[PDB]
Design a protein around this ligand. Structure first.
Ligand SMILES: Nc1ncnc2c1ncn2[C@@H]1O[C@H](COP(=O)(O)OP(=O)(O)OP(=O)(O)O)[C@@H](O)[C@H]1O
Ligand SMILES: Nc1ncnc2c1ncn2[C@@H]1O[C@H](COP(=O)(O)OP(=O)(O)OP(=O)(O)O)[C@@H](O)[C@H]1O
Ligand SMILES: Nc1ncnc2c1ncn2[C@@H]1O[C@H](COP(=O)(O)OP(=O)(O)OP(=O)(O)O)[C@@H](O)[C@H]1O
Ligand SMILES: [Mg+2]
Ligand SMILES: [Mg+2]
Lengths: 121, 557, 477
């Protein structure tokens, strides 16, 4: 397992199930590569706080107050309800996007491993 | 506006049933008896998400399709001048009401099978007369009952993600003008213009893209944050994940569906909840105005700790599946003792045969005798209910309207009334005659001299109890016809009539009846701690203890 | 043969947890206090289908991933040539045991984070000493721990399918697993089940020999109606997660009243503060006062428990080992002896002294004329009870430090000290306290039908009813 990495490519899977792993692989990019994205890491926290003042529109700020006020009529528990999304932007263009996603992840992550592609149909 | 009746014909295990209802309804019963099939008849009648799929072969009674399915719901509209829900009904059904003061309304469902299509079509009708129902008008996938009724169904297997996603079309999807923060949204747009042109680090992913050459509220996830911690764990337990879904349904009912009539169909809300959360949910169900119309199914007595103004429906089996209903109100005279009667009666609602005893010493002695004789009596539906001495009307009418067998074992008491000496009040006979609906008897005068005091006063009162029990023999036989077992003097004299040789052997006294009644609770534990197997069978097989033989349900006596 | 201890050094919501166990363990607690996380610590240690996926970031305490997850389980193994499961362990352990320590065993789990592959590897070790633990030998996907323990995890029209799944699981455990040690892990068996079936499952769970080893998480009191020879684990709802254990046994003296005891305590196990009252008249009066003053006392963790004709030790030991606050309100009595005249034993003071850890006092005798007697014998015994309460004062202060509230005569004289003008108004008699003694179940209902607001606050704010302020728990500091 320390030498071989097998990438299995099937067109029946979509971009969402690889994209859910890519939500933590973005954090692997920001931590890795001997802090090459450390020039961007102070201003990727600027993009992280772009997702902080989406919490102060009043359609979200009304929900954050009224759900907690509906929840605290049972036992007055010491809870809080928060909301977060954490998205990112980039049956043939999804597949051609996922081919470049697999080639990009093979170029970044697996420089120390032998990569074997199993491309089925 | 009030629900009055439902009548279900040929739907699943119901062949022909008729159940009176109210706004707040609680359904309870055994397993595989049809509590979920009762709630799905309301889902096929009033919820449009199940009605569009039609009926299969398995929705018919004993799987044959030669009988039609007919479900009729009756509403009462006698409070049109004060309630706004009645106007919400009448403003959609503006042509089908017949008389000028029609206070009833009927919403019906009929279904006949198609063997070539193998399909069960559902045709809905409404009106004010039962023989003159007209078809509901509709255009496309929408008829006119969807403009009046919103049905919220809460299953036991809620998933917070799924519910939030499906409802995220209602919240977070409004324009609302400007909301006084548009330059903050311009700063959202301006800081996205300094990230799309310089994402290359030191030209490692800009060069990777060189070689080949807004509304982001879709994936928002609600979390529960405890105070004092800042982390966001995705794994949460099923206690708070249920109650956040209940809060989201309450918020969507109080915001998006203010124009409609909201009906809750809740299946088993005690699942993965604590006891105190069940008591808090019971108080919010039966006191506050959040749930005005609900139909509740449950298996837990802790959700019935706060019940008032409630139709209780019990589904059971005698020959077929039959549902017995009862309208539950606590009176003004029981308003100070309401919580103790609710905590007593809420466990006795889930039984088959209930023995109503008068204190804890009877519970100690009867639990010893049923521990030694029939130890699986509560597996088979038996229950012992502590009344408290005074409350025989409320328990017997609540258990008798639901089809639960009530058994009463009680004493013959004399009450010393307030302010007068020598004139005493008949108590146990007055309670058992008020159980039959008759008038209370007049008070009696007992001449006790002042020098006679102590055991001889108790002996004269016991001889007067023997004389009064001898006088009313036909009333005692009329009580014994209706499973009321009045003792002659006390419980301990009937216990001395059965095992009195062993009571003289254990207590080492010439008067073991008086030593049992000197301290009632601690000497009963001493009698229970020295009883044998033969003495418990001598109590159980006796004539004077037939209430235990009625409680075990056998035909031995 | 027997489990002894589990030491969860680090997991999700456990920072340092050490729990004494047994066979037949039952774990209860509040909502979101890691009752499930405890059952996943047994699944990650013993079951292989959970252990084959490793540990994520979220399985560490406060998402730290710099500390080591360690779960250590202790087995007893004290006997030989009677128990067959001990030979089933000794056969696979082989030379991992030492004669000097041949009656203890340890199975440990270690996990350290990688932070490059973002994966948590699980290394299992077994040994007869806590130092020098060696690794479990394994061939392919199977190590040698899977040749000993088989773990059955249960998590559920409806109702009868769950009982049919119980019959399928018990039939597979009886048929296919004769050569293995079977551990059942049951997650909430009160779900979609009638209460008669809950009492039947409790009788089968605590009486039959088919469930030799289980860990049971529950929310229902009706699954604890038959509990005997069991271990009770409670997870406390404080800001630090504390787990408390009690070894529950019912003695030979309490075997004739076992049913009542179990039923009553089964609902009192799910509380936070339990007030132990004597009878139903105290239940009528305290339910009226706690309805008129603090009606959400049952929501916040209060409970009223009627204990009659019992020496208080079973309830106080069971609720004290589990970390539940117990408050006792009681009155002193003078019980006459059988076959003896004029000799009274001091019953309530002996109950409170046996709770404190002392011995029973001597039997007092009185020279009352007896030949001439009447209502005035009750005032003579009340004067003797006042002299008993005057003589023992530092013992009453020692009871008052341990949340035991002994009355001077009765509850009724303490009620007459607070609202006695209202008792003179309602009962219209010169002796209202003597009138309620004639029929306790009837005149208490007649009393609480006629009290209102500012009588219940005068009961609640009185210094002779401080047990209600202990049960509510509103502290001034
Ligand atoms: N409501 C809409 N408004 C505008 N564009 C839309 C809308 N719905 C879909 N689209 C566009 O149409 C596309 C749908 O592609 P579609 O699946 O029809 O292509 P295709 O030729 O069948 O694909 P393939 O050859 O890969 O199977 C979406 O990717 C999107 O760009
Ligand atoms: N079409 C049908 N014809 C006859 N009987 C049926 C039909 N469909 C279901 N049943 C009966 O109804 C039972 C299921 O009832 P249901 O699931 O409503 O019970 P329940 O009271 O909700 O149960 P629980 O409380 O244990 O979950 C089946 O076991 C069967 O006996
Ligand atoms: N890695 C972790 N670090 C810290 N706290 C965690 C971690 N994982 C889970 N938790 C916390 O542990 C609790 C998880 O709830 P859990 O399912 O263990 O409780 P429960 O008592 O079984 O609940 P329920 O009554 O709903 O079944 C939550 O409070 C959650 O925040
Ligand atoms: Mg069901
Ligand atoms: Mg849980």
């Amino acid at each position: 397992d320390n030498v071989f990495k097998v990438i299995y490519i099937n067109p029946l899977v979509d971009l969402d199930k690889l994209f859910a792993q890519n939500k933590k692989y973005i954090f692997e990019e920001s931590q890795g590569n001997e802090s090459d994205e450390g020039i961007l890491n102070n201003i990727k926290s600027l993009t992280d706080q772009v997702n902080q003042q989406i919490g102060e529109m009043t359609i979200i700020k009304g929900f954050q107050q009224e759900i907690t006020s509906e929840y605290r009529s049972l036992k007055k528990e010491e809870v809080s309800i928060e909301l977060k999304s954490e998205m990112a932007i980039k049956d043939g263009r999804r597949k051609m996007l996922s081919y470049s996603i697999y080639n990009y992840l093979a170029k970044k992550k697996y420089e120390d491993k032998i990569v074997i592609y199993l491309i089925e149909e | 506006m009030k629900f009055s009746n439902i009548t279900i014909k040929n739907f699943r295990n119901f062949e022909k049933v008729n159940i009176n209802l109210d706004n707040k309804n609680v359904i309870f019963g055994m397993n595989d008896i049809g509590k979920t099939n009762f709630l799905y008849a309301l889902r096929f009648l009033l919820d449009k998400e199940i009605r569009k799929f039609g009926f299969n072969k398995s929705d018919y009674h004993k799987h044959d399709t030669s009988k039609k399915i007919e479900i009729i719901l009756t509403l009462d509209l006698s409070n049109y001048e004060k309630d706004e829900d009645t106007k919400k009904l009448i403003s959609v059904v503006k042509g089908a009401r017949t008389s000028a003061n029609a206070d009833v309304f009927y919403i019906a469902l009929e279904s006949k099978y198609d063997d070539k299509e193998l399909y069960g079509n559902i045709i809905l009708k409404w009106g004010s007369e039962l023989d003159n129902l007209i078809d509901i008008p509709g255009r496309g996938n929408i008829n006119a009952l969807d403009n009046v009724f919103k049905v919220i169904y809460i299953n036991p297997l809620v998933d917070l993600d799924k519910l939030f996603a499906q409802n995220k079309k209602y919240i977070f999807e409004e324009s609302q003008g400007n909301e006084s923060d548009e330059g903050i949204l311009n700063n959202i747009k301006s800081l996205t213009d300094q990230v799309n042109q310089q994402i290359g680090e030191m030209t490692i992913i800009k060069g990777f893209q060189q070689e080949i050459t807004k509304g982001f509220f879709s994936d928002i996830i609600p979390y529960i944050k405890k105070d004092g911690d800042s982390n966001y764990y995705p794994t949460s337990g099923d206690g708070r994940r249920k109650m956040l879904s209940y809060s989201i349904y309450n918020y969507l009912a109080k915001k998006k569906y203010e124009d409609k009539i909201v009906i809750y169909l809740i299946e088993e809300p005690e699942i993965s909840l604590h006891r105190s959360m069940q008591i808090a949910l019971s108080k919010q169900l039966f006191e506050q105005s959040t749930y005005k119309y609900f139909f509740l199914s449950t298996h837990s007595p802790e959700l019935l700790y706060e019940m008032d103004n409630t139709r209780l429906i019990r589904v059971h089996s005698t020959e077929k599946v039959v549902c017995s209903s009862h309208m539950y109100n606590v009176e003004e005279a029981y308003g100070s003792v309401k919580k103790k009667l609710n905590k007593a009666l809420s466990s006795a609602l889930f039984a088959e045969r209930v023995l109503l005893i008068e204190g804890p010493s009877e519970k100690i002695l009867f639990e010893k005798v049923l521990d030694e004789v029939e130890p699986e009596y509560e597996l088979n539906g038996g229950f012992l209910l502590e009344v408290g001495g005074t409350y025989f009307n409320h328990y017997v009418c609540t258990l008798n309207d639901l089809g639960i067998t009530h058994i009463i074992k009680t004493d013959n008491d004399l009450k010393s009334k307030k302010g007068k000496k020598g004139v005493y009040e008949l108590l146990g006979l007055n309670r058992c005659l008020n159980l039959l609906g008759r008038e209370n008897l007049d008070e009696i005068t007992i001449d006790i001299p002042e020098d006679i005091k102590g055991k001889k006063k108790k002996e004269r009162l016991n001889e007067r109890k023997k004389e009064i029990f001898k006088q009313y023999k036909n009333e005692v036989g009329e009580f014994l016809g209706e499973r009321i077992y009045l003792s002659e003097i006390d419980l301990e004299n009937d216990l001395y009539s059965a095992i009195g040789e062993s009571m003289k052997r254990i207590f080492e006294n010439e008067d073991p009846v008086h030593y049992l009644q000197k301290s009632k609770l601690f000497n009963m534990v001493e009698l229970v701690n020295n009883l044998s197997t033969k003495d418990c069978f001598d109590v159980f097989e006796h004539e004077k203890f037939a209430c235990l033989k009625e409680l075990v349900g056998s035909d031995r006596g």
